[PDB]
Structure formats: C-alpha cells, structure tokens
Design a protein around this nucleic acid. Structure first.
Ligand SMILES: [Zn+2]
Ligand SMILES: [Zn+2]
Lengths: 121, 121
RNA sequence: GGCGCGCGCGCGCC
RNA sequence: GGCGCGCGCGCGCC
C-alpha cells in the first residue's frame, strides 16, 4: 500500500514513514534506522516490566523543543534495544493527497506490515 | 429471568419487585402498584426539563428517613404521573439466594422487561 | 507496547 | 430518566 508519514499527533513533526516500520509478534511496532533515533528521546520507565518477549525499560517522547509528547516505549528485545511505538500518538498523512488520519489501535491502520527482522539488524 | 427484589442501594430497604416494573418507550422504568408508593417520597425537582413525551415534575427518594437515597424522578407521561427509576440507586436481590447485584445501567440488567401498557392504568 | 478494565470532572441531544 | 461525546487519573495479565 501507499507509503505514509507518521507525524507527532502533537507538534506535527515528521517521525518516520511506514516504509521504515517493522512489526513484532504481529502487534508491536518499531522503527528502523538512526534517523528515527534523532527523532525521540527516551527516559527511565517509572514501572519497567517484563512481558512476552520484552523488558519494558524506557518511555519515549517526541524529541522536539516544546512538545515532548509520549510516543511510547523503549525495550530490550532478544539482544536488541529498540523503540516500540503506539499509533495513537501520531497522525498518518497520505503522501499523494495530504489526507490525515487518527488511529487509536494498530489493527485499524492497514498498511504494509513487514515483520521485524534480525538479518536487517 | 426470575422475579427479583429491588432494594434501595444505600439502606437495603425493599422498594419493589421486578414483576411490577414496566418499561416506557424502551428506556425508562417505572413501577406499578401502591406498595411502591409507600416506599418513596417526592420533592420539588431542582431543575425541571422536558425530554420527549415526559416532563420532569420532581425528584423521588427512598422513604426511610435516615436514608433519603435518591431513586430518580417523577414525571407526567401523557395522562399519567409516574415514577421513573434508575437501577443504579438500587440493589437487585435474587429472591431464592439473597445474592445481590449492582448495575449502573438498565441495559446491563436482563429480566423480563414488560412494556408500559395504559390499560393497566 | 498489546488487550481489557475501573475512576474523577466537563458537554451536548431526546 | 435515557443516550452520545471531551478531558484527565489509575489497575490487571501477557
Ligand atoms: Zn511533538
Ligand atoms: Zn434507603
């Protein structure tokens, strides 16, 4: 499907394109590349936890000046440390139309969901 | 689906039975008979209104003096002056067992919902 | 995160 | 009464 842009629900800054998105265990979403790294800052999770395949360690936020909108978490997965985002904190913008959409749950946003991959990393 | 007793949620007093209840226009619950009239007291309605075919004429409360728990309102439905109750002010007691259930909305409470019938007065 | 839920206050309509 | 919604707090498992 059409590649799309995820912008902070709050400031509207560009976070990533679904192109760089990956799915884990069909329900957890993360973003590839250092580029996405410069886009958020993480911070010690007040109530870390271990569930399924992760150790929820940090809480992440939009890395821009006066927004710091909670974008989700940062976790240890296998031997990787990675961000796991929640579609609710972003706005999906269609590239060829500008149309924007607010999703609350990932199941509702139907785009090409490529499973997370070790090889790539 | 059996006959249950309705009890004032706050003081536990007997208000009425489910066999006496009747549903007006699928959303409002009144009570037939004199017994139920010996159970509540009416008082001026703080801010009368007028929704659909009803007109708020008063607030009704549990009769037991030391209780006075709000049970709902009293309205004019067509040519009738009748009490309209909200299950949330009551405790539904199963007659055989004593088992009591707290509901906040009438839709969640499943029993034989006999419709208001003018013939019955 | 994902899933589900509880609570507090605010608003509108019939 | 009944229904729809907004904002914010918290809980559980996995
Ligand atoms: Zn932002
Ligand atoms: Zn009472």
């Amino acid at each position: 499907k059409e590649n799309k842009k995820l912008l902070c629900r709050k400031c509207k800054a560009l976070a990533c394109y679904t192109a760089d998105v990956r799915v884990i265990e069909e329900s957890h979403y993360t973003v590839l590349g250092d580029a996405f790294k410069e886009c958020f800052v993480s911070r010690p999770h007040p109530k870390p936890k271990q569930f399924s395949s992760f150790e929820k360690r940090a809480k992440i936020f939009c890395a821009r000046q006066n927004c710091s909108h909670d974008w989700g978490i940062h976790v240890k997965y296998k031997t990787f440390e990675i961000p796991v985002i929640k579609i609710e904190s972003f706005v999906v913008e269609d590239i060829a139309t500008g149309v924007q959409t607010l999703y609350s749950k990932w199941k509702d946003f139907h785009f090409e969901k490529i499973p997370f991959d070790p090889a790539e990393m």
